[PDB]
Design a protein around this ligand. Structure first.
Ligand SMILES: OC[C@H]1O[C@H](O[C@H]2O[C@H](CO)[C@@H](O)[C@H](O)[C@H]2O)[C@H](O)[C@@H](O)[C@@H]1O
Ligand SMILES: OC[C@H]1O[C@H](O[C@H]2O[C@H](CO)[C@@H](O)[C@H](O)[C@H]2O)[C@H](O)[C@@H](O)[C@@H]1O
Ligand SMILES: OC[C@H]1O[C@H](O[C@H]2O[C@H](CO)[C@@H](O)[C@H](O)[C@H]2O)[C@H](O)[C@@H](O)[C@@H]1O
Ligand SMILES: OC[C@H]1O[C@H](O[C@H]2O[C@H](CO)[C@@H](O)[C@H](O)[C@H]2O)[C@H](O)[C@@H](O)[C@@H]1O
Ligand SMILES: OC[C@H]1O[C@H](O[C@H]2O[C@H](CO)[C@@H](O)[C@H](O)[C@H]2O)[C@H](O)[C@@H](O)[C@@H]1O
Ligand SMILES: OC[C@H]1O[C@H](O[C@H]2O[C@H](CO)[C@@H](O)[C@H](O)[C@H]2O)[C@H](O)[C@@H](O)[C@@H]1O
Ligand SMILES: OC[C@H]1O[C@H](O[C@H]2O[C@H](CO)[C@@H](O)[C@H](O)[C@H]2O)[C@H](O)[C@@H](O)[C@@H]1O
Ligand SMILES: OC[C@H]1O[C@H](O[C@H]2O[C@H](CO)[C@@H](O)[C@H](O)[C@H]2O)[C@H](O)[C@@H](O)[C@@H]1O
Lengths: 332, 332, 332, 332
């Protein structure tokens, strides 16, 4: 009899229950790992699954993480090239994508990514049919649409990180300017993720007091404080970070973990995420854009309809036309 | 027309998924509420259900907790006299019991408790057939056995709090004695909860260093440092708190929340809990006593076999015999 | 010779550093203990001190909490009738007060409380001259003013719980109404704590969307959705819980712990707390009312100036006048 | 008047208090960042300071981290090439070091590191004289000694990560073998960090039951289970991870954060860390080796004296001679 057989005795004759809040992260590059590390440290999952085509790198990250088990409240951390390791996941974060190339059209980049998703997505759904897909891959808005198409899942179970982090970045800068914690500064950045995103000036407030009211010119050329530059810094953040260190990851990881917390714990919290906006704000095309949504364990179950100005609804309609412009040329 | 309707639009077609880690607490006395506040403050559940026999108190406690929602990460808190409110619980903490009466025999008291359980246990199982029962009511060892028989549940899903807190109290006292945090002081109190519990001196250590190795007289009459007084302080703990403030609640509440976390998060952690021990250390009847067990989302799946001194086993057998003697005279 | 001596050797030459975030709770009634259990379960302090006038109860509560040390991350929990036990506290939560008496005038009740504070306040300051006083006792607005005068402390270090919980209750009710988490529902209840508090309808929003924008009649007689009943439910909350369970405690405890966290962790977060408002919204006397303030380790360092409707300010002035009327008749 | 001057009013006339639990991380390479990220996610500090000679990389990491402020409870995150930014730190984690070279003697590598520390250490002590230095740089044992010499701080305030992580790795593997959480598997790896470390077989236990007792041959050639290979995997872990992904970081980061938690919160917890062992286990040279110690806010205030076998004390004496062999040739 081994030490284990002499020390521990199995007394259950019932089949093991299986994970309750399993999370899978596709792509263990810096973004994937930042999300994984954030999810582990915040004790959100009872089982973390990792997958990536680069086998050695995947095995090393998983191994590195498993060695810290003593400091975590996660039952197990699994990794493998075969997607069967992701079975029964509640949430699957997709960070994988195509490595851009030399002067390659945007339609070709997107199509390259689509081809990558044609493998990934169907393999994810085979082992976790009741999951919720959280797409982080860029371009996020269109790629979320692709994931939604290829998966066959209802809209509530396919979400894009959208402008979740850009709104957090806005609140942070707003916080540094006012001298108060970002969680007390309210502001929303919606629309298309990137340079075309929309800062909704009418909602910027502290304790329910809107700053636009105190400065009606806020966000325009007539602004004596140039708030427009704050949103400009939000869109140029990733670029600035990359110019300084080559990649961007920590902020995105905390944002993804934040989204997973609301999903896993069924919080029903409002987050600006990418979802189907067809029929909203004059948008009639089948595109995904960021708007405030309610997240829980059933996914994106509710969408907030914002009171937007003609100029704002217009920017959204324009972004939607650009996305659809690429989407209608794709082969799914 | 509604303000809600104009602001929020439900976009899901799927029926809501339901709770993933629901917890029910039976009895809203001091012990039950302490457990409830401990489970909520530690973000262990997405839905807490409370049930008791008094409508107003039950409703008052729920309302008080609900008013604190802003500070919690629990989707909802519900309470009712009807057990249907506890549907789909993963863990059900049972604290309900009969108030003691002077001049009463031990048998009457235990039967009174059984009478209560005959109404309660089947109600729980009807709505949560796949739950894990955590019995905290006293006498915990006999009452856990009763819940096991009445529930019809397999042994791995019926657990008694047993000596979990008494071991924690022992580690706390040991800690105060050596000047270090209780999590670094290791010691186990097993067997029958209370006066007849057994402190396993051979396991008492810090960083793996046997304290009995440094003082072989430890725990005996020859013991010059009188460690026996530490174990006597443990068993007398409830009594002392009771005659100072009137009852005990906080330590038990923290203790139950600790057990729930191991179970809800499938930690497979070792806890000294009450479980069936027939066939161990000489016990030959179906009785529940405390021994180190491994707990997860499948319940109590493994038991650790400690190597005990024939003397230590003798106390366990005497206890078993005392417990069996009472069980045969009960009316289920 | 000692077992301790052979096992552990003290190797420091320096005297121990003392606590860095010590918290004291004055009064161990239901409210005080709820605050104590909330502060400990959320790992906010390295040393918790309890003080009250009854030796046995005080000692019983401390012992109960100490028995749960294994499950906590607080170095020590101490309790005594002598205020020297509260030395070097960063935050002192004051909940002590006079039990009400039927047929009693408002003035007698408040004076009775002042009589209590004249003994308590100087004792606290003698041992913790650099603490931040958090007054929770009712009537909080007048009693915070009294603590300020008696303490001799600068305004930034004397805070009243004010409408912090009532605003949380409002966000909770709003949340239940719209079907989303209270942290996503924004609304502020300011002014005099209780019946005369003011709900600032202009600030009520979700994701920055003015609900008053969608329903301008919100809060008035023309209001078809009767939002006024939500604010009336807030003010009637304590009363309802009181006649159901006998007292309130949990929500207040969570509320105080929330305020302590902002202060202990220097978050500079916005909270609706009671502070000196002379010179704001027309108030001309030294009275404390609730308004949004920024809290950190330096205390209440900044106050937010909400743009209120002349009608809203009128209620604040009426309150100020009612409060001043009572303060001039008090004997400090 | 700006929006800020009209919205927020400073009401404090007292000097700001300053950080209470500030932490500085020297070297923002992967190890530094893994530690920083672990410290932030576990809400341990109210101010995180980062420093590194590589200015761009430093600015990018800090920037990346600051953008996630909304998801953290840390007042501020600062970074700079000038050490004045680290003023008033409670704990300073040193990860910086010399980049090894082609067939360079060990004495020269160490001396190169010493030269790096001759700048760093005195700059750290200039701005934070009352801090606690936590050295992670390899070779950790000797480098901790160097830091201690150059700083002039008492031994309780200069600690080396030592075998903290290797013991965690041991407990993890032990856990995977037995099928239980690592926090329930006790085992200690002491001595010199690396291939010469010592696994203390007599302390390996589960619930106080030692495995050596159940298998007296445990750890020797006569072992029928080859436990010696478990310790072999612990020493070869870093290498295996690096062969798979080029670097090692996550496990080390969680371990450092774990150490900082005990220090910052004055937990008085037992950790196997590197400290002055002169006078212990036959060691008479002035060297640092890992042994179980008690950590709190005064630093390493206590050392546990383990009951070790002649063969074990010997390995320690040998390691100490090797370290001293290098140390006596250094120019500090
Ligand atoms: O497609 C699988 C890979 O996806 C990620 O990496 C890619 O995405 C990175 C960030 O967008 C690019 O820098 C990289 O060039 C792309 O190949 C993931 O990080 C990789 O580990 C996955 O193999
Ligand atoms: O390596 C740890 C566990 O691996 C298995 O589990 C993974 O792979 C399965 C398919 O082979 C999935 O179904 C499961 O969800 C994954 O976690 C193995 O079966 C377990 O026993 C191992 O502990
Ligand atoms: O009032 C809160 C919710 O109550 C229901 O849910 C509880 O009671 C049910 C039995 O009546 C249980 O099945 C359920 O699991 C409990 O949570 C009601 O059905 C929900 O709509 C209410 O929100
Ligand atoms: O039986 C239902 C009640 O059980 C508990 O309360 C009783 O048990 C306590 C512990 O022995 C006694 O002190 C108390 O006097 C008994 O009434 C539970 O605490 C109650 O809330 C339940 O209604
Ligand atoms: O019994 C616990 C500790 O009590 C002392 O500390 C408390 O009481 C002091 C006044 O008597 C305060 O100054 C101190 O801040 C309190 O924590 C005693 O001095 C400590 O040695 C005891 O461990
Ligand atoms: O005055 C010292 C006591 O203050 C609180 O208790 C009293 O105040 C409560 C709230 O008004 C009353 O309900 C109670 O009747 C008063 O005695 C505190 O809760 C007590 O523990 C303190 O001793
Ligand atoms: O000495 C300052 C630098 O220290 C660290 O980097 C060095 O240490 C790494 C791990 O041991 C080596 O891989 C690297 O080659 C050494 O130069 C830190 O990571 C750097 O950012 C600091 O500038
Ligand atoms: O950039 C944020 C803060 O920087 C200052 O603080 C840092 O630099 C000081 C020396 O210049 C240190 O004393 C201080 O501890 C560091 O945090 C600046 O003084 C603050 O106002 C800024 O908020």
């Amino acid at each position: 009899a081994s030490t284990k057989e002499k020390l521990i005795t199995h007394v259950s004759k019932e089949e093991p229950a299986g994970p309750t809040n399993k999370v899978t992260v596709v792509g263990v590059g810096m973004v994937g790992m930042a999300a994984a590390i954030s999810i582990l440290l915040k004790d959100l999952t009872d089982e973390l699954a990792l997958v990536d085509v680069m086998e050695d790198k995947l095995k090393g990250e998983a191994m590195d993480l498993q060695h810290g088990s003593l400091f975590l409240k996660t039952h197990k951390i699994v990794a493998d090239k075969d997607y069967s390791v992701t079975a029964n996941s509640k949430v699957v974060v997709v960070t994988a994508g195509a490595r851009q190339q030399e002067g390659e059209s945007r339609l070709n980049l997107v199509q390259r990514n689509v081809n990558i998703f044609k493998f990934i997505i169907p393999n994810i759904i085979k082992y976790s049919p009741n999951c919720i897909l959280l797409v982080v891959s860029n371009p996020v808005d269109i790629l979320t649409y692709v994931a939604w198409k290829l998966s066959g899942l209802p809209r509530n179970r396919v979400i894009g990180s959208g402008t979740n982090l850009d709104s957090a970045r806005f609140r942070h800068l707003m916080g540094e300017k006012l001298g108060i914690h970002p969680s007390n500064c309210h502001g929303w950045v919606i629309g298309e993720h990137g340079d075309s995103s929309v800062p909704v000036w009418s909602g910027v407030n502290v304790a329910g007091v809107f700053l636009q009211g105190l400065n009606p010119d806020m966000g325009t050329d007539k602004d004596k404080e140039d708030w427009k530059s704050v949103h400009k810094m939000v869109v140029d953040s990733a670029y600035e970070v990359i110019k300084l260190k080559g990649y961007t990851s920590w902020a995105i990881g905390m944002s993804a973990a934040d989204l997973c917390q609301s999903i896993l714990k069924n919080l029903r919290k409002c987050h600006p995420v990418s979802t189907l906006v067809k029929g909203m704000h004059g948008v009639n095309e089948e595109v995904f854009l960021s708007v405030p949504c309610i997240l829980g364990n059933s996914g994106l179950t509710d969408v907030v309809h914002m009171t937007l100005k003609s100029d704002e609804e217009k920017q959204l309609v324009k972004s939607a036309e650009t996305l659809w412009g690429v989407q209608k040329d794709l082969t799914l």
